[PDB]
Design a protein around this ligand. Structure first.
Ligand SMILES: CCCCCCCCCCCCCCCCCC(=O)OC[C@H](COP(=O)([O-])OCC[N+](C)(C)C)OC(=O)CCCCCCCCCCCCCCCCC
Ligand SMILES: CCCCCCCCCCCCCCCCCC(=O)OC[C@H](COP(=O)([O-])OCC[N+](C)(C)C)OC(=O)CCCCCCCCCCCCCCCCC
Ligand SMILES: CCCCCCCCCCCCCCCCCC(=O)OC[C@H](COP(=O)(O)OCCN)OC(=O)CCCCCCCCCCCCCCCCC
Ligand SMILES: CCCCCCCCCCCCCCCCCC(=O)O[C@@H](COC(=O)CCCCCCCCCCCCCCC)COP(=O)(O)OC[C@H](O)CO
Ligand SMILES: CCCCCCCCCCC[C@H](O)CC(=O)SCCNC(=O)CCNC(=O)[C@H](O)C(C)(C)COP(=O)(O)O
Ligand SMILES: CCCCCCCCCCCCCC(=O)O
Lengths: 63, 606, 64, 172, 57, 173, 99, 459, 86
């Protein structure tokens, strides 16, 4: 019973913390986007229309 | 930017840290109970400050935060509303449970799963603090169900005991029927007023809440254990003594009346529902007290005293005095928690025996526990200028000074006179008199944890009302000019309540025989409610479930209507279409029939 | 094992369409279903009349 | 088996006085009223009319079933007592120890060593146990559920394990 | 160790990834057959960018 | 703040001047001063790091502006080529109209708590604003059905002036 | 003898041979590897990593986008004294009412 | 899709052409990988359903169900590699073939663009399931269960085939897009009533309303654990997906014809939930519990309200994880005790303390406590139905009370109480059984943070 | 609570049997059946273990109580029930 709980807690953290520090890092390295009107004669990128940089990256990837 | 914004949430988030550490298992498997006690004690210290700017500044705020989900025109989001009721109820809840946590490491100094017990208490604790701090009805439903299920585990803590599960089942049962009114009030507000935030419901002037308020009343009735939906609370004793000391004193059963306090501004508009509160409140006081004074168990008497108080509590709502109801909530916390505090101390010391017939003589033997019991019992009656008189006596004076429904006024009066009766029964068969317990006496109370826990509650239950009543901003017009007899009646009714009770109690001291009384037979059997309404309806519903519902309908007819009839129809005729005798004479004769009939009457020829 | 079989399997082979089971089947069967049909339709018809004539008030009811 | 005249009245005595305690309380009363009931119990002690003795038992229980206290007093460690099955939550059966992990078993080597002595004893004693029963069982199966003792020498009593190795009432 | 042996044991692990690699190929090929009114809808009508030749592909 | 003040109009906040009478100091004031340079100042310092780091390399985003197209009132029947654009525009306006009620509801709740127990009298214009919004919403989409569509709005609406003109001709008589 | 069938087989205990067994197979080395793959690709890649993925999709249903147009629409309508949300979505000028 | 389908079918040779004992390892690893791909498809555009090709398209209703099926697929392999460990490789590999062949059919069923294409695989799930119940099922009644399960849904599904082809001859194409864009008022006439009956009864057999539910206690109980999950976690919701979709050309008629099934379902939930209180088999208890919660979804659709569908999809998927998990719970003790009678294995919390926990949130989730999706599903339907008629809360509200009574009854009778003395073949829970349950409970709580992904297309 | 060891038990037993005014203290014997050696009534014998029951704060089942007759076996019965092993 303890070993299984130890296995989950240790291993689920194995990817937990690197993503957790990653989410904070992007929030404290490049920051969040801010509102801006549509510039003249510029087509906005499909992924550019989103606030969170990870969200923008997710839009740049598969979607 | 005031601390009233961030701190009032900090005193909520810090309640969750001990829960998380248990998952990490870094939680101190040696001194976890002290970890919980100190954390709750700390949160009480944090819970102090929001009170101060409530008295000084008088500010009331509402917190809206992370948006769960946006539902068309319903923005269901996490929300915390710091109202006078919420901000006042936080410190008293933590202070009471911090004292209870102090008691637990004394009473539970031997339970092997003690760490699990403290884990449940915090989970219960955090569950109510969001129940009392809610702004949207759905989050108010978050804690409402959470406290019930948490109470289920806590009552069934001694899960080996069969009757503990049955009482645990009873608690979740009556809660569910009470819950039906909550979900009914849930849909009505969403359909008509188109929200669950308390701001919109009050804003949209739902002055015809006839059905929602009836559901709201039903929700309170199940949780606060009023007549009809109550015997779970008297039977919620299989759980350990600290459990009933925390949950079923003023920190689980109170939830029902506190719900009505939240919805007070629209409750006063309707008159039928509030009158029904006088009906339910008045009868609850008596039938609990009537079945209380004839109980030979200290824990049963104490729990019955609670249900009478909340029975008295909803009476205060019915006269459009909801703030005074909340005053009664805080004051009742200090008394009844110590009442269960005292019982837990004597029970454990006297070889975990609760039958009130086996105490006596502990007055000189147990001075401190005796002093606290005198403190609590006298507060319960309403000793002037004590924490009891600051709420109960004011309530009775306000009760008669209104358009009270005649019988409700009389019913509370006799109940409050009956309030002292079981209190005397406690002090009489307990310390006062000649002892009756087994010979080996191990009466010990000198444990520092037990002494400090009771003393902490003791000091509170003398100056609690003074501090609260003086510091609270006046939110209710008082009544100043009373005819003397009914302004004094609250004091006097307990004076006879003392007077006859001691007379009939010392009547047992008389050497002559005591005849069995049929009224006593009715009273001592909890008014026959469990013996009737718990084995008659359960049998009928469950016997219907198997004999007819699960047997006659499911696999006696439903499997017979469609499946077996079709199978039998195919069965019967497949015999008839597969039992040819192989005679070519019969075969070709049938050919003659078909060729004759086909060329004929069916008009295939044209 | 005998009890579990008796409460689950033996029930139908031992079944007999006596009028006692027949009437009790309809009484606990079609009976309640039609009874709920009557009350629900009666109220439903009562509601829709007031809605159509404009008697019922739902001015704040939007999220149906 | 059945309950003869003396057992029925003795049970009636035992249960009535316990009920009388819940009624009378205040020990001074208890001893006085016990003496009264005992006195009026003494007067009829021979009454060789067994029919009359049963007749005197009729209103005896009827009086009990009318005058019994609705909440009879029971010491907590009793059926219906407040401390009933309280510690049944913790009496884990002994056979569960066999599934302990070897590293976990290493924490208590001497006790596990003692478990081996008891285990090998129950393995040896089992054969003699069944032999005694079959060579002593009366015709037509066991008439009485009572088990026999270890009539031979150096022999364990029949069906000795579970009663002897039962979990203690206070395992904590 | 023993590349041939691990291939004999664990070579099957590639079929699903290449199937996914296959999977993306149709979605970037079947779309061409469904082009039709690409850059024809009124709502998303945008002027031809100066190096771009078509919209979404 | 970043959000527009006109969209969420917060009436001016009138604050009393602390003028105590008793000589003993206010525990509120002293504790808040302790709360000031224990939590707020470290929070302000930490945020300034974040804001200065965010402003060091700023990246922008805009808001998509879907150009309006002919709706289902001009799209000829059995022309799903134009119905799809018309249907999508109506569903897009559906969500926008849902947000309009969301905005008005938030203003309604905001005034209710802001005025405390003076809620009923101070902000009654908010209630009549929300009442008119919901009433028009009831004339609109409400009761379309689970599978709501721009066609169903046309049917529900067109049914309404049918009654309205029927009412109008009767009133004129 | 009715017939020649083996009796009921004994329910084997995976712990009896190797107490360190993870309840995944008979062979110890694959049990550890089965335990690795079920966890690693069960929680980290899908549960943990997927949760961050699913938590961080772009605007779902153009939700905040829908809110944004309301503000300017709100500011437009009340400033010029026109009811902030018209009763009929489809403009009656466009449609024709028969008879 | 031509994106998740190929990896699923390419997994079929992968199970066949693999090492002897590595079949479970390889199948489990890549099945989870398939799910990870499916997690992406969850995001949906506001109004237009996500269209991939002419044959396949996914809306915001298929996607929440689609990820569940893919995420389910590893769980049966985990839950079934215990009792089948004593079986030949060929039959072992064949079992993996049956499951993934089943999961392939659901993947192309939920995403089908054409109703006829939807029907073809909607029924095609019958064949691999019937193999699973009959072949590897461990009981005698499984033969009768297979016939009951097959004929019930097939006899209902045949009118759907006749109904669907009739729509083809009348309204041209039948894909889920043009049907919703070219909707016409179904004129109230006796023929259209029978058209309505055909277009609905097929799906309503799948999610068993009261009366047409006798195949659940037969199929689910006798089926193996891997089969037991799918017959209660996806195929019950298969009727749901069809019911949402097909209720697009039947809505001048649903209002008038909802009454007979609505009263049957509304009374059924009180009826079915009552069956639980006096049950004997744990597996039947869960199966009958599935009838009541699903019968709530029957009401959820037939009211046809934006809230009603909104709580419908939330309830079905929350139902799937919960009931599948409870079916694992029944399997764990059943393998260790070799009987399904509840009272036989009393007092199991003291022996297995983690299984006590895993059962605790299992029964708690079936309680539909807030904020667990079971609550956010049931509570949503309560409000929508209450607006439909006020007396609905009298029935469905009481159902929640009855739901609590048996849901704790199974927890109390088995886990709580004194342990059973004669049973001595109970071993410490394998890390597989515990890990299998964690992958059931954590996802359920994880979605609780964001119901936007679970609220369906009407969101 | 201190362990209720055997000698402490038997000290409590013969202390309350010698308490019985009908049982003379000087003739106390731990192994002496209450009738054939001492002389009493079974009506009195049942009263004895009721006194025992309150002495040790628990219930002696009547089926076992009737078999319980000797002061030493009195100590023996209470010892096993309270799992006293010394
Ligand atoms: C610092 C930490 C940041 C954490 C951010 C949050 C977590 C992000 C986790 C991403 C990986 C896991 C989720 C994968 C979802 C499916 C990916 C997908 O769409 O694949 C097809 C996608 C797109 O398919 P496509 O190539 O047909 O798309 C055509 C359009 N473009 C090219 C613009 C994308 O494949 C690729 O982008 C090719 C590269 C390999 C992709 C392999 C997929 C799994 C790993 C990613
Ligand atoms: C700023 C960002 C701070 C860090 C955020 C980290 C994530 C987080 O907590 O976000 C909170 C946000 C809160 O949103 P918010 O509106 O408060 O804004 C975020 C920014 N703050 C907090 C500063 C205001 O919510 C979400 O992101 C939703 C999380 C949903 C997670 C769902 C997990 C599902 C897992 C499924 C596994 C199984 C799949 C297969 C089966 C499927 C079912 C059948
Ligand atoms: C206006 C002002 C009215 C003031 C009324 C004051 C009444 C005070 C209460 C007196 C009666 C209750 C009482 O005295 O209870 C204490 C006592 C308990 O006795 P008992 O439970 O039998 O235990 C004996 C153990 N040896 O002795 C008893 O006799 C208990 C009696 C039990 C039944 C009491 C019924 C009281 C009914 C009151 C009216 C209810 C509404 C009508
Ligand atoms: C096991 C029994 C069945 C279980 C429950 C299934 C649902 C009950 C209803 C079953 C209906 C089956 C046939 C429906 C196919 C589609 C019909 C349709 O779309 O509607 C037509 C409805 O028309 C019908 O007549 C359909 C069939 C009605 C019922 C008669 C046959 C079905 C009942 C008996 C067979 C099934 C029972 C089992 C028998 C062993 C419209 O055509 P129309 O008649 O308007 O044609 C144009 C013009 O008017 C000329 O006809
Ligand atoms: C508070 C209300 C309840 C208050 C409490 C008392 C309630 C009951 C009161 C009335 C009781 C009644 O008189 C007696 C009855 O029950 S039955 C007849 C007894 N007649 C015999 O038994 C004849 C044979 N004699 C023996 O068997 C032995 O003499 C005996 C075992 C009795 C004594 O022990 P030794 O001596 O063997
Ligand atoms: C004369 C002795 C005291 C009697 C007290 C009776 C109750 C006093 C208050 C009565 C309230 C009446 C309200 C109206 O009338």
């Amino acid at each position: 019973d303890r070993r299984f709980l130890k296995l989950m807690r240790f291993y689920i953290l194995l990817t937990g913390i690197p993503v957790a520090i990653g989410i904070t890092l992007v929030n404290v390295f490049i920051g969040e986007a801010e509102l801006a009107d549509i510039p003249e004669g510029y087509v906005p990128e499909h992924w550019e229309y989103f606030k969170h940089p990870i969200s923008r990256w997710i839009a740049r990837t598969f979607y | 930017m005031n601390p009233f914004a961030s701190l009032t949430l900090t005193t909520l988030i810090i309640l969750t840290i001990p829960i998380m550490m248990s998952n990490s298992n870094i939680y101190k498997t040696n001194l976890y109970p002290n970890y919980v006690k100190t954390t709750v004690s700390y949160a009480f210290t944090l819970s102090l400050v929001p009170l101060l700017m409530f008295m000084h500044t008088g500010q009331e705020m509402i917190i809206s935060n992370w948006h769960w989900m946006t539902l068309q025109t319903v923005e269901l989001s996490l929300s915390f509303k710091m109202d006078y009721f919420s901000v006042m109820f936080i410190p008293v809840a933590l202070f009471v449970t911090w004292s209870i946590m102090e008691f637990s490491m004394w009473y539970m100094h031997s339970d092997p799963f003690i760490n699990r017990f403290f884990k449940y208490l915090v989970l219960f604790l955090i569950t109510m603090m969001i129940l009392v701090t809610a702004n949207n009805l759905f989050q108010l439903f978050i804690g409402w169900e959470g406290v019930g299920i948490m109470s289920f585990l806590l009552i069934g803590w001694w899960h080996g005991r069969t009757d503990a599960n049955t009482a645990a089942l009873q608690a979740i049962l009556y809660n569910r029927i009470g819950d039906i009114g909550f979900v009914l009030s849930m849909a009505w507000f969403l359909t008509h007023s188109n929200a669950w935030d308390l701001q919109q419901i009050f804003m949209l002037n739902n002055e015809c809440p006839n059905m929602p308020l009836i559901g709201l009343l039903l929700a309170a009735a199940g949780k606060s254990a009023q007549f009809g939906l109550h015997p779970w609370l008297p039977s919620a004793m299989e759980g350990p003594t600290p459990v009933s000391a925390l949950l079923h004193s003023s920190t689980m059963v109170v939830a029902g009346v506190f719900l009505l306090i939240r919805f007070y501004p629209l409750m006063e508009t309707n008159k039928l529902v509030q009158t029904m509160t006088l009906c339910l409140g008045a009868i609850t006081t008596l039938f609990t007290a009537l079945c209380a004074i004839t109980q030979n168990d200290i824990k049963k008497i104490v729990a019955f005293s609670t249900s009478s108080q909340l029975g008295l509590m909803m009476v205060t709502i019915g006269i459009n005095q909801p703030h005074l109801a909340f005053l009664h909530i805080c004051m009742h916390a200090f008394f009844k928690a110590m009442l269960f505090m005292c019982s837990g101390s004597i029970i454990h010391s006297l070889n975990d025996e609760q039958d009130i017939r086996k105490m006596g003589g502990l007055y000189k033997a147990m001075p401190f526990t005796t002093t606290a019991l005198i403190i609590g019992s006298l507060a319960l009656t309403g000793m002037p200028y004590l924490t009891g008189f600051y709420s109960k006596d004011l309530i009775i004076e306000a009760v008669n000074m209104s358009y009270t429904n005649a019988w409700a006024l009389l019913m509370t009066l006799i109940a409050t006179s009956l309030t002292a009766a079981y209190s005397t029964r406690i002090i009489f068969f307990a310390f006062l008199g000649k002892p009756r317990f087994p010979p080996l006496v191990l009466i010990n109370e000198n444990n520092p944890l037990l002494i400090n826990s009771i003393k902490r509650l003791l000091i509170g239950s003398i100056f609690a009302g003074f501090i609260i009543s003086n510091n609270i901003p006046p939110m209710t017009v008082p009544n100043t000019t009373m005819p003397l007899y009914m302004k004094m009646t609250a004091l006097i009714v307990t004076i006879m309540g003392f007077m006859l009770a001691l007379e009939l109690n010392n009547t047992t001291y008389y050497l002559k025989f005591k005849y069995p009384s049929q009224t006593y037979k009715f009273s001592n059997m909890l008014g026959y409610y469990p013996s009737i309404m718990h084995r008659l309806p359960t049998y009928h519903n469950l016997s219907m479930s198997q004999k007819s519902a699960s047997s006659l309908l499911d696999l006696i007819w439903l499997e017979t209507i469609l499946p077996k009839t079709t199978s039998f129809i195919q069965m019967k005729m497949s015999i008839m279409v597969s039992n040819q005798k192989g005679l070519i004479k019969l075969y070709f004769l049938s050919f003659l029939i078909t060729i004759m009939i086909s060329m004929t009457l069916f008009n295939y020829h044209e | 094992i005998r009890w579990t079989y008796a409460r689950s399997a033996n029930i139908y082979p031992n079944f007999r369409p006596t009028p006692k089971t027949s009437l009790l089947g309809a009484l606990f069967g079609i009976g309640p279903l039609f009874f709920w049909y009557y009350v629900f339709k009666t109220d439903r018809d009562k509601k829709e009349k007031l809605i159509q004539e404009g008697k019922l008030d739902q001015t704040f009811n939007i999220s149906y | 088996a059945y309950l003869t005249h003396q057992q029925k009245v003795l049970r009636l005595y035992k249960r009535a006085l316990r009920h009388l305690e819940s009624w009378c309380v205040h020990r001074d009363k208890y001893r006085y009223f016990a003496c009264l009931m005992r006195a009026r119990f003494d007067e009829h002690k021979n009454e060789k009319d067994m029919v009359k003795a049963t007749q005197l038992l009729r209103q005896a229980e009827e009086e009990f079933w009318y005058g019994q206290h609705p909440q009879p007093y029971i010491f907590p460690e009793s059926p219906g007592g407040t401390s009933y099955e309280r510690y049944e939550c913790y009496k884990v059966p002994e056979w569960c120890l066999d599934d302990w992990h070897p590293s976990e078993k290493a924490m208590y080597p001497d006790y596990f060593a003692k478990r081996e002595q008891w285990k090998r004893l129950r393995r040896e004693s089992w054969e003699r146990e069944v032999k005694q029963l079959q060579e002593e069982t009366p015709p037509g199966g066991p008439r009485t559920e009572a088990l026999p003792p270890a009539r031979k020498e150096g022999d364990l009593p029949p069906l000795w394990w579970h009663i002897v190795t039962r979990p203690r009432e206070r395992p904590m | 160790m023993n590349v041939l042996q691990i291939v004999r044991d664990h070579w099957v692990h590639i079929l699903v990834p290449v199937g996914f690699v296959f999977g993306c190929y149709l979605d970037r090929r079947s779309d061409e057959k469904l082009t039709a009114f690409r850059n024809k809808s009124l709502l998303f009508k945008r002027e031809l960018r100066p190096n771009e030749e078509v919209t979404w592909k | 703040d970043s959000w527009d003040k006109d969209v969420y109009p917060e009436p001016p906040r009138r604050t009393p001047a602390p003028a105590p009478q008793t000589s003993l100091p206010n525990p509120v004031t002293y504790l808040t001063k302790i709360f000031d340079l224990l939590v707020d100042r470290p929070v302000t310092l930490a945020r300034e790091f974040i804001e200065q780091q965010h402003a060091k390399n700023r990246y922008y985003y805009y808001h998509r502006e879907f150009r309006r197209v002919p709706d289902i009132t001009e799209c000829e029947e059995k022309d799903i080529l134009c119905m799809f654009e018309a249907e999508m525009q109506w569903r897009r306006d559906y969500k926008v109209d849902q947000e309009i009620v969301n905005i008005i509801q938030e203003r309604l709740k905001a005034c209710q708590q802001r005025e405390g127990e003076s809620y009923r009298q101070n902000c009654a214009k908010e209630l009549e604003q929300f009442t008119q919004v919901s009433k028009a919403f009831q004339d609109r989409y409400s009761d379309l059905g689970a599978h709501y569509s721009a066609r169903k709005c046309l049917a529900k609406q067109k049914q309404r002036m049918l009654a309205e003109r029927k009412a109008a001709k009767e009133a004129a008589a | 003898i009715r017939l020649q069938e083996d009796p009921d087989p004994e329910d084997e205990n995976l712990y009896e041979k190797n107490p360190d067994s993870h309840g995944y197979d008979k062979d110890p080395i694959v049990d550890l590897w089965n335990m690795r793959v079920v966890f690693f690709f069960g929680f980290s890649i899908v549960l943990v990593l997927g949760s961050t993925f699913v938590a961080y999709l772009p605007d779902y249903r153009m939700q905040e986008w829908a809110r944004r147009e309301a503000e300017r629409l709100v500011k437009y309508r009340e400033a010029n004294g026109l009811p902030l949300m018209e009763s009929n979505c489809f403009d009656p000028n466009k449609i024709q009412l028969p008879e | 899709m031509l994106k998740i389908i190929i990896p699923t079918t390419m997994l079929l040779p992968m199970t066949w052409m693999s090492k002897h004992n590595m079949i479970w390892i390889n199948a489990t690893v890549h099945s989870l990988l398939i799910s990870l791909i499916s997690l992406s498809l969850l995001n949906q555009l506001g109004e237009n359903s996500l269209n991939f090709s002419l044959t396949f398209f996914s809306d915001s209703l298929s996607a929440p169900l689609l990820v569940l099926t893919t995420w389910l697929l590893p769980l049966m392999l985990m839950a079934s590699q215990s009792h089948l460990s004593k079986e030949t490789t060929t039959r072992k590999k064949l079992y993996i073939t049956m499951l993934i062949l089943l999961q392939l059919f659901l993947i192309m069923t939920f995403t089908a663009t054409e109703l006829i294409l939807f029907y073809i695989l909607f029924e095609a799930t019958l064949v691999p399931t019937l193999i699973i119940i009959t072949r590897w099922g461990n009981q005698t009644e499984r033969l009768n269960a297979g016939l009951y399960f097959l004929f019930y849904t097939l006899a209902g599904s045949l009118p759907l085939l006749v109904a669907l082809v009739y729509i083809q001859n009348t309204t041209g194409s039948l894909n889920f897009l043009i049907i919703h864009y070219w909707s016409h008022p179904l004129s109230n006439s006796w023929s259209n009533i029978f058209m309505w009956l055909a277009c609905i009864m097929a799906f309503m057999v799948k999610m068993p309303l009261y009366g047409l539910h006798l195949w659940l206690p037969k199929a689910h109980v006798e089926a193996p654990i891997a089969g037991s999950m799918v017959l209660a976690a996806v195929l019950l919701k298969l009727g749901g997906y069809g019911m949402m979709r097909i209720t697009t050309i039947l809505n001048p008629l649903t209002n008038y014809m909802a009454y007979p099934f609505l009263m049957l379902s509304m009374w059924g939930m009180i009826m079915t939930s009552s069956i639980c209180l006096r049950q004997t088999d744990l597996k039947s208890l869960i199966a009958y519990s599935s009838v009541s919660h699903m019968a709530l979804v029957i009401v959820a659709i037939m009211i046809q309200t934006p809230w009603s569908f909104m709580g419908a999809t939330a309830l079905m998927i929350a139902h799937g994880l919960t009931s599948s998990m409870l079916f694992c719970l029944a399997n764990t003790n059943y393998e260790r005790v070799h009987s399904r009678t509840m009272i036989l294995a009393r007092g199991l919390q003291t022996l297995l303390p983690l299984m006590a926990t895993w059962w605790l949130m299992a029964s708690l989730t079936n309680l539909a406590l807030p904020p667990s999706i079971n609550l956010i599903g049931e509570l949503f339907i309560i409000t929508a139905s209450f607006s439909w008629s006020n007396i609905t809360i009298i029935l469905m509200g009481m159902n929640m009370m009855i739901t609590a009574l048996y849901s704790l009854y199974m927890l109390i009778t088995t886990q709580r109480g004194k342990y059973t003395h004669h049973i001595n073949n109970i071993k410490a829970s394998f890390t597989r059984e515990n890990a299998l349950m964690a992958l059931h409970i954590l996802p359920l709580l994880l979605l609780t943070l964001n119901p936007k992904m679970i609220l369906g297309p009407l969101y | 609570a201190p362990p209720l060891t055997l000698e402490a038990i038997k000290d409590r037993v013969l202390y309350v049997l010698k308490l019985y005014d009908k049982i003379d203290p000087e003739k106390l014997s731990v192994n002496s059946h209450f009738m054939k050696d001492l002389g009493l009534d079974s009506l009195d014998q049942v009263e004895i273990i009721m006194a025992m029951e309150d002495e040790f704060g628990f219930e002696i089942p009547d089926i076992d109580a009737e078999k319980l007759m000797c002061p030493q076996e009195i100590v023996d019965y209470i010892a096993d029930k309270k799992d006293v092993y010394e």
